[PDB]
Design a binder for these strands. Structure first.
Length: 49
DNA sequence: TGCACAGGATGTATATATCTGACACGTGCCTGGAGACTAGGGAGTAATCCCCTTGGCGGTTAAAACGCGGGGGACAGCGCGTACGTGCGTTTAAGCGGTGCTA
C-alpha cells in the first residue's frame, strides 16, 4: 500500500525492485524480520480530569 | 636653698610659593577625495566528462576486545646530611648629572 513503494516500483531501478523483493521475502519468511509484533499495552492519559 | 617665671633660643609642622611635564591650540603641506578615461579580470554563462555512493548481503579473514596471572613499578615513610635560606659587616662599581667632541 505504501505510496513510496509504488513510486519505487515505477522507478524501474533494478536494484530498488530487488530490494523490494527481498523485503517481501523477509515479510513472508517471518514477520519478526520486518517488524516485531508490538507488545500491546493500555493507552496512558497524561493527567486525570 | 630651692622654686617660679621673666626674659630669651634655637627649630618646624604648618603654610605659602617656586621649579618641572604634559595636553590643547595654531600654522601650513604633502597630501585624500573627487572627475573623468580607461580595459581586461571578474563574473555570468554551459557544457562535459569523471568520479563518487548504490545498499544490504554471506562467506570469510585480521584486528579488537575481553579475561586472566602475577610480578615488579609506583609510591608513601623516613634516616640523615648537607647545601641553600636568612642575616650580618664590608666593597664595588652601577647610577646620577656634568663637559667636551664627533661621525
Amino acid at each position: 500500500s505504501r505510496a513510496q513503494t509504488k513510486a519505487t516500483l515505477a522507478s524501474g531501478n533494478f536494484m530498488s525492485i530487488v530490494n523490494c523483493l527481498m523485503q517481501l521475502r523477509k515479510v513472508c519468511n517471518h514477520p519478526n524480520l520486518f517488524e516485531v509484533r508490538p507488545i500491546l499495552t493500555s493507552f496512558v492519559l497524561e493527567h486525570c480530569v
